[PDB]
DNA sequence: CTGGAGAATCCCGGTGCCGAGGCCGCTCAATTGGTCGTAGACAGCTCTAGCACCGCTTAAACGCACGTACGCGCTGTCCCCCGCGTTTTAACCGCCAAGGGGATTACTCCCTAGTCTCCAGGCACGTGTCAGATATATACATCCTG
DNA sequence: AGGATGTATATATCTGACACGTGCCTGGAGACTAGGGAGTAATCCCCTTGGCGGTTAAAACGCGGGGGACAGCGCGTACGTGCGTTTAAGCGGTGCTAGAGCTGTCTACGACCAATTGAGCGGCCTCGGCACCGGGATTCTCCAG
């Protein structure tokens, strides 16, 4: 009997790493730190989006809420680049839809 | 077929009730009342008896359930502090309320915190309620109270507490 | 300095008689007398002008001002050196060099009031979890101690575990247990030993701030009484305020909730008569009016109310029709008394304490007169009762 | 409408002193006034940016007291007394 | 026709479907928009790419082919914006930036 | 000959005065102008509620008073009764600001 | 026509105040501060209970969750006394039905 | 007739309103029956705890009415409430009187 | 299980120095060690109380890494590399 | 004569050493004993995952190192190179822990 | 200011083993497709409140002069902390063993979500009557010379 | 000690902000049904605790000394205090209209459900990174000169 499946962002972090640094690896502890970092960013952005929806009496978390949460949480140029990447991704997703 | 009983423990506060149930609580809830049934256990040669004990916490005086506190009871213990004799004030009231609500149920008057001892002589002589010195913090006669109640409830004049 | 005077300051010398249970020395006849079914004479070296019964002790106040006491001295209720065995069961002089004019016995404490207006308070207070002290949290005064007040006290009335001090200006000072609202100034969130602030909240005297019921000014009380766990404060205007336990409607309230702030009881609200006396046990109240009629309300079990057999719980003052004109009414734990204006005393209620002066343990649902060799040719001046005994103050008739 | 300029000088030397006295300060250096203005400018830039972001997300053109309260709360500076 | 992953449609590596399910089941709002998971995945991927690129540069500086927590710490603390973002975060086995106050140096 | 208070006396008097009151210590109109000037770099033609500027002023005054408390603690730590910019920088650096 | 209703803890706060201080009053600004304080306490406890339910993979916010949140949030004696008050309230509520 | 849940719980605070707020605030998929009662009890207890000290401060200041200054004094002079509200600013609250002993005159 | 006692002294003097060295401290007074031990004890009490609260809520007898991580997170001391 | 380094040379060498390494600086077993001792005050017969104690130690050492960094700034702000208990007290008071 | 002596660190070139990276099978979580209801978009209107402007009053700010008390540099003293050798201690490692308890599965039932009614609790208006803000005279505390 | 100044204390005296009462309406209570969340019980195994012996690195102790903390003193100027002058805030008032707030209608977008399959997880295996020993080459510190 195999152990219960436990989900992580490991494979996706690895794919991103191979994109940025094709010849670089990552240790298990560094991978755990990166997984925690991704989960923390998810939680922060989702919580801010939830607060934005509640403040405006909106029942939905749209990409507008996510964009505003990104602008509130990430600092400086990080926010600008995150918003640019998100807009690019949503445009591409809607194009293929 | 376990024998089980419902014992109501009535007395003034700070008389050792909390430290008196726990010293037999090896280690539930009266939803009607709002007090935790404490399952004491005493094996006895006749077979196990489990005194489900709920402390009224004085709510028989300050509470609103009226007969609800005693109505489920099948036996009672009246506890008071023989080092603070003021806690004998309400014993006749409790006795009358018990005999009224529950009819003929056995009741025991236990003198706690006993450790000159000339104080305890008076109540030993009163013939209304059985009087037992339970001491506590000395484990001197902490099964004597419940033994009398079990003897009366089960009806066997020779029950022991193996 | 001024000399305090109040309508409750008894000043008629008389003899002390006791009946009931004397297990812990509350009768006053020594070790040889544990139970007295009829009233029995109590020997005090000087004539007594007030005899108050506490929960388990008795305090007799002399004509010259010396407070005598006898009964259970476990928590220092007697306020005197009771080291010698047996001195608890015979009245001994309380060593308070001030001249006392009024006493009041609670359950494990006693308050003596001085001519000047200073309260001497000894013993301790008990909540539903043990002892909480007298003036310092968790410490009990085995000798008289002066309650620090900025105002003189004209009357002291003691319930079981609180002390209501009525000042010359009319305010009301309370201290002791406040779990059931008896203090009238500690909310329910804080009644459990003052919560975080501690027992300093329950044991340092403070006024019962009864809102702005007098508009710009607070209500000023002219008399204050105490049942076991509730307080009645009669205002200057005649209104009766009751704070305390009302689970059996013994405050006259329409519900069973404990009144943690003073509540103007609409049950007593009237204008054709006035309320001039109160007394309660745990669950019943007996009150008299200026006309001399005695009413009862609250729990109806064992004839507490005095209303004829078969009476049910009363949430309004009900007339005790069987009585003649009454000058004073008193309540024990489960009994009630009425002293007729011509000196006779009637009793009703639970009789298993032999508190009724009838000679039988049966419960008297209707008021009956008390008799005995120690009441013939005598006039009862006052009656007080505790949990298990009744203390009578009598006078020889001309 | 007109554009505002050089308003940090409206936080005057007496005003900064009063904030200092309320903070328990007895002697104030002459260079504190220009250092305090920079700190205040940074703090208000951080707070107002988030308030303006909340207003923009609401699709409003008026910055409200609740926008400011949320911006302050988002920085661990909860503010009672304005409808929080 | 073979099913297309929403990540491929968005041009992302991170899981759009998983992030959508986490948003739906995370008690954030009554409803979750179609584009919310895509945007969130893109932002998470961008931040991870930034941190990983800086960590890989740090690893190269230390002559290591593999990223360890030390390199993540160096990358995060040597970048002003990431350091601000993760100011309240402790990275296990990360150490500290070499920093000796000038007053403590000799002479 | 004219009466003068020795240095540090009126300062302590003021410390007492401003630790008893709750009034805002910055003037309202200059602060409103400062708020509007800062905001115009983030969005153009913004309108501000009266209570929005008041909330900002309350927050700013509280922040600066707390910062000055910390600065005063730092200055005393250096055996000085005078606060200097290096004292504010220490307070902010330790707080985690900047 | 009357404006849309806006709920607040003003009347309940006033009743509590009358319970603790029968003679004292309260101003409008103090009422707003107390309303914000009550809202902040509610939000903190609710959010902590939500985290407690999510960590333990539960779909319900029960009295256990609220009690654990109270113990995690309030310092020391406040936590103890608040736990006591909450348990008393729940026991009183259950016994009447 | 209809009986209030607050009255049954012996509370002044609204159990039904708090139940609705819990059910609508995206705090959890389901809300138990005793959760609003416990939370209302705690909120009422904390409100009373703050109000008792605020009224005491008002009385010390000889004021019949509680103002934000009294709330600030009550909160900041109480250690536990101060820790509970460490990162809170009370509008028009002011600060506690405090002058460092070194700053006072030598005397 | 025996009751543990006097373990704060197990944070030896050289151990505190090494923490000071990583902190960039060149010279340490002799009274620093007791103060550091007190600070560490306060910090650990605060964290472990919350960790044990989480554990007891989960009805576990074992304090897991996630309990510690949550306890740190709710004190504004987020910790990466152990889960969550 | 035996070779000796001047006071402070070895201190700087150690600072450089421990700011380049990532090893835990408190001995493992004593810290585990301390954690178990603190825990039993809150619940008897507690068990700890091996990683539960490691997380506690990482957090504790990070907190102490960050505190010593602020302590060092406090000492330097007073023109001292020696850290003293008052430096820790100032750093904690400004941080909002006291 | 220089040129050795040491001591420490930084580069090696050599081994080994263990964690990282890849592969394979499986299963359950995501993708399709369709249906339905309502949440959010958009339009239109109301009228609140924010912006703007001017005039008058005056408390607050700015600018200055004089003097001092605090900041800060230099000198001494001594004692306390750093560096180094020696000894003691116990941490760390490896290994073994025994249970407690965490993690999971099955089943049951009871608690909560969702609806429909009904009505009363709480809100928005509107009003009155004090608590607090105000102005004034006064007593008292404090500070500064002396 | 006495003079000068600031602050606290006792009347006044209005002002409008609490505190209450009324009417209304919408949201909370009550009754009812349906289903699935979780409470209990039972099982498995893993991983936590306890013990035990050996090595040796680290901790503890004592020494000698130098350099850093702290005290004291001097002095220079920067800050406080206080005055006279200038100016901008604040108040009161008015007016315009921009936009917040609300309502009504519509549709398209997300929730939900059922079927299908491949993406990602668990487990296994392999070998290339990196850690670890010896062995020199610089770097740096210290001091006799």
């Amino acid at each position: 009997k195999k152990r219960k499946r436990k989900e992580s962002y490991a494979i996706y972090i690895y794919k991103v790493l191979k994109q940025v640094h094709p010849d670089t690896g990552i240790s298990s502890k560094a991978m755990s730190i990166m997984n925690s970092f991704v989960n923390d960013i998810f939680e922060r952005i989702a919580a801010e989006a939830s607060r934005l929806a509640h403040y405006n009496k909106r029942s939905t978390i749209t990409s507008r809420e996510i964009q505003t949460a990104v602008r509130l949480l990430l600092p400086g140029e990080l926010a600008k680049h995150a918003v640019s990447e998100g807009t690019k991704a949503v445009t591409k997703y809607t194009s293929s839809k | 077929p376990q024998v089980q009983f419902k014992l109501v423990l009535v007395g003034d506060g700070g008389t050792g009730k909390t430290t008196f149930v726990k010293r037999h609580l090896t280690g539930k809830y009266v939803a009607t009342l709002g007090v935790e049934v404490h399952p004491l256990v005493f094996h006895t040669n006749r077979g196990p008896i489990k005194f489900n004990v709920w402390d009224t916490a004085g709510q028989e005086k300050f509470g609103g359930l009226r007969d609800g506190y005693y109505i489920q009871a099948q036996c009672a213990i009246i506890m008071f502090d023989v080092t603070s004799r003021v806690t004998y004030k309400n014993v006749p009231n409790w006795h009358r309320d018990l005999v009224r609500v529950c009819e003929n149920i056995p009741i025991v008057l236990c003198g706690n915190k006993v450790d000159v001892k000339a104080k305890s002589i008076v109540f030993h002589r009163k013939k209304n309620l059985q009087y037992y010195d339970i001491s506590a913090k000395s484990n001197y006669n902490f099964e004597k109270p419940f033994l009398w109640l079990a003897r009366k409830l089960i009806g066997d004049p020779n029950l022991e507490f193996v | 300095k001024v000399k305090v005077s109040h309508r409750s300051h008894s000043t008629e010398p008389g003899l002390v008689l006791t009946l009931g249970q004397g297990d812990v020395g509350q009768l006053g006849l020594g070790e040889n007398v544990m139970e007295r079914k009829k009233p029995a004479l109590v020997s005090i070296p000087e004539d007594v002008v007030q005899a108050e019964a506490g929960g388990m002790h008795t305090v007799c106040l002399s004509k010259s001002g010396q407070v005598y006491s006898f009964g259970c001295n476990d928590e220092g209720a007697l306020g005197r050196d009771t080291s010698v065995e047996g001195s608890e069961m015979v009245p001994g002089k309380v060593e308070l060099q001030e001249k006392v004019v009024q006493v009041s016995a609670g359950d494990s404490h006693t308050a003596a009031l001085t001519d000047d207006g200073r309260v001497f308070l000894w013993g301790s207070f008990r909540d539903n979890n043990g002892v909480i002290g007298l003036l310092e949290p968790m410490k009990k005064s085995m000798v008289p101690v002066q309650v620090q007040l900025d105002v003189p006290v004209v009357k002291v009335a003691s319930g079981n575990d609180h002390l209501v001090m009525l000042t010359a200006d009319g305010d009301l000072y309370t201290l002791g247990c406040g779990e059931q609202g008896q203090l009238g100034r500690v909310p329910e969130l804080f009644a459990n030993r003052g919560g975080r602030q501690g027992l300093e909240r329950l044991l340092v005297p403070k006024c019962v701030m009864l809102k702005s019921r007098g508009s710009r000014g607070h209500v000023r009380f002219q008399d204050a009484f105490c049942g076991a766990y509730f307080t009645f404060a009669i205002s200057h205007e005649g209104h009766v305020y009751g704070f305390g336990l009302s689970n059996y409607h013994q405050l006259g309230t329409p519900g069973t909730e404990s009144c943690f702030i003073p509540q103007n009881l609409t049950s007593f609200k009237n204008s054709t008569k006035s309320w001039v006396g109160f007394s309660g046990g745990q669950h019943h109240t007996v009150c008299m009016d200026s006309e001399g009629k005695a009413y009862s309300l609250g729990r109806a079990e064992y004839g507490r109310l005095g209303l004829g057999e078969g009476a049910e719980e009363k949430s309004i003052p009900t007339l005790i029709s069987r009585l003649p004109a009454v000058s004073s009414v008193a309540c024990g734990a489960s009994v009630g008394y009425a002293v007729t204006k011509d000196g006779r005393v009637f009793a009703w209620g639970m009789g298993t304490n032999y508190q009724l002066g009838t000679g039988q343990d049966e419960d008297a649902w209707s008021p009956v007169e008390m008799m005995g060799k120690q009441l013939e040719n005598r006039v009862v001046l006052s009656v007080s009762s505790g949990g298990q005994h009744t203390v009578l103050l009598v006078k020889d008739k001309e | 409408r007109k554009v505002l300029r050089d308003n940090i000088q409206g936080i005057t030397k007496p005003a900064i002193r009063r904030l200092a006295r309320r903070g328990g300060v007895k002697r104030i250096s002459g260079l504190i006034y220009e250092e305090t203005r920079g700190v205040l400018k940074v703090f208000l830039e951080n707070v107002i940016r988030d308030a303006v972001t909340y207003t923009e997300h609401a699709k409003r053109k008026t910055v409200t007291a609740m926008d400011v309260v949320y911006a302050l709360k988002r920085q661990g500076r909860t503010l009672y007394g304005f409808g929080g | 026709g073979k099913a297309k992953s929403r990540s491929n449609r968005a041009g992302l590596q991170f899981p759009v479907g998983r992030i959508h399910r986490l948003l739906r089941k995370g008690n954030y709002a009554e409803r979750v928009g179609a584009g919310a998971p895509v945007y969130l995945a893109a932002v998470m991927e961008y931040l991870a790419a930034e941190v990983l690129e800086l960590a890989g540069n740090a690893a190269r500086d230390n002559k290591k082919t593999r990223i360890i927590p030390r390199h993540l710490q160096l990358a995060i603390r040597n970048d002003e914006e990431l350091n601000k973002l993760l100011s309240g975060v402790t990275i296990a086995q990360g150490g500290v930036l070499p920093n000796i106050q000038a007053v403590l140096l000799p002479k | 000959k004219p009466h003068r208070y020795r240095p540090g006396t009126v300062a302590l008097r003021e410390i007492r005065r401003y630790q008893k009151s709750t009034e805002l210590l910055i003037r309202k109109l200059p602060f409103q102008r400062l708020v509007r000037e800062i905001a115009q770099d983030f969005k153009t033609d913004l309108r501000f509620q009266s209570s929005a500027v008041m909330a900002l002023q309350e927050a700013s005054e509280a922040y600066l008073v707390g910062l000055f408390e910390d600065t005063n603690l730092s200055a005393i730590h250096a055996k000085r009764v005078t606060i200097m910019p290096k004292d504010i920088q220490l307070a902010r650096r330790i707080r985690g600001e900047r």
Side-chain angles (χ1 to χ4, degrees), chain F residues 4-63:
Chain F
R4 285 183 57 91
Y5 285 117
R6 266 152 46 69
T9 303
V10 187
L12 286 160
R13 189 178 300 146
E14 281 176 286
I15 291 163
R16 289 166 196 130
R17 179 186 324 162
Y18 292 111
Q19 289 183 340
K20 246 166 55 73
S21 80
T22 66
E23 68 224 350
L24 286 165
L25 302 169
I26 302 168
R27 309 245 63 74
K28 289 197 166 72
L29 255 62
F31 189 91
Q32 184 175 139
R33 284 204 303 274
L34 176 63
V35 165
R36 294 180 191 276
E37 164 172 357
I38 285 163
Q40 90 196 342
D41 295 310
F42 307 125
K43 177 144 139 62
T44 291
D45 294 34
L46 270 174
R47 294 162 85 81
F48 274 91
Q49 292 201 290
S50 59
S51 45
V53 182
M54 271 317 99
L56 281 170
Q57 200 171 341
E58 291 284 353
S60 308
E61 304 238 334
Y63 170 78

Side-chain angles (χ1 to χ4, degrees), chain C residues 58-79:
Chain C
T58 300
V59 293
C60 300
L61 174 50
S62 164
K63 177 64 169 174
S64 296
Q66 274 129 359
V67 161
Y68 289 77
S69 70
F70 51 117
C72 176
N73 192 60
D74 295 16
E75 280 188 19
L78 267 54

Side-chain angles (χ1 to χ4, degrees), chain C residues 210-221:
Chain C
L210 198 186
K211 184 43 214 169
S212 305
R213 286 209 54 98
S215 74
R216 223 304 184 178
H218 47 237
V219 305
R220 294 285 214 176
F221 307 98

